[PDB]
């Protein structure tokens, strides 16, 4: 499903992303926008045989298992298919584990290139949270 901006914001807030390990809600809404335009079914195939899945484009080489990715570590202990659900539960759980790695949201290139150091709060402003 394709989330509306505020709709995803409300959902992400309910899923405890507002201020998780020091990152405000806007950071996550912004990251979702640039990673997949709020599309839970977004997928991106990579040259190394791995694929990025979901609204936060999580990779199958390190984070989830799709049963066909060379050297998969499945750090999030989940099938990549769980990351394509209209229910963002799994994508959020995994995103939290990723951000708990020593590099914060820098794990997401799109966030680094389009959200980092910006007025990310603008992404939730206007929404009734």
């Amino acid at each position: 499903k394709v989330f509306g901006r505020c709709e995803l914001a409300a959902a992400m807030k309910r899923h405890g992303l507002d201020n998780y390990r020091g990152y405000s809600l806007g950071n996550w809404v912004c990251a979702a926008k640039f990673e997949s335009n709020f599309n839970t079914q977004a997928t991106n195939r990579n040259t190394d045989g791995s694929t990025d899945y979901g609204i936060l484009q999580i990779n199958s080489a390190w984070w989830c298992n799709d049963g066909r990715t060379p050297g998969s570590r499945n750090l999030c202990n989940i099938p990549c298919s769980a990351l394509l659900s209209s229910d963002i539960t799994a994508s959020v759980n995994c995103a939290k584990k990723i951000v708990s790695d020593g590099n914060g949201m820098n794990a997401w290139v799109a966030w680094r290139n389009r959200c980092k150091g910006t007025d990310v709060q603008a992404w939730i402003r206007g929404c009734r949270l």
Partner: antibody
Amino acid sequence: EVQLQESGPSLVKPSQTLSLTCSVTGDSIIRDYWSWIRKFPGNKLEYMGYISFSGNTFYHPSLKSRISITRDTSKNQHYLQLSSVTTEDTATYYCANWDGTYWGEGTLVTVSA
Amino acid sequence: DIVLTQSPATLSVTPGDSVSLSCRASQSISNNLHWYQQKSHESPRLLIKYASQSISGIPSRFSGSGSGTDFTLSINSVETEDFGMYFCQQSNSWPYTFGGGTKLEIKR
């Protein structure tokens, strides 16, 4: 059949270093984040720290700079080292994966002279 | 550090009855509150993660609710094997911290 087995000196003297090994079997160290938790005599739990897939560590400030968590990907083990211990470090130590779905048996390390 | 306060300290119950355990955080932690059970001479066992998400393999009588600074672990009809310690733990901010725990004891 994922199992975590803790091992290390059950007795350490004040000012010495407490060391514990978490041997993981049925799973790989590089396939998860690993944590160390301790339970004091009165049922008080303290999260000591964890080490991520990248090797980055997060230590509880309560432990000052006495704690060190490392891993050995070839032996599939991660280790906890706590230096300059005092009787207050006497506790049951547990290792677990960051998800909290897998836990070691728990080893009581007593600090005494 | 976020302080988690659990109550009651001890809860006596007759098997078959339902009970609710409380955990309050000194600051908002969203849904980043997890519930652990720990029985005598055993390691902690994860029951509920992220306030209300069930852990595959945990009995359905266990459920969690709440958000922000107020959380509740509910046990619909406590059973014989459910007595022991229950702790809540937050993962919203480092360092992770645990509540003081609630002892579930058998009423006689």
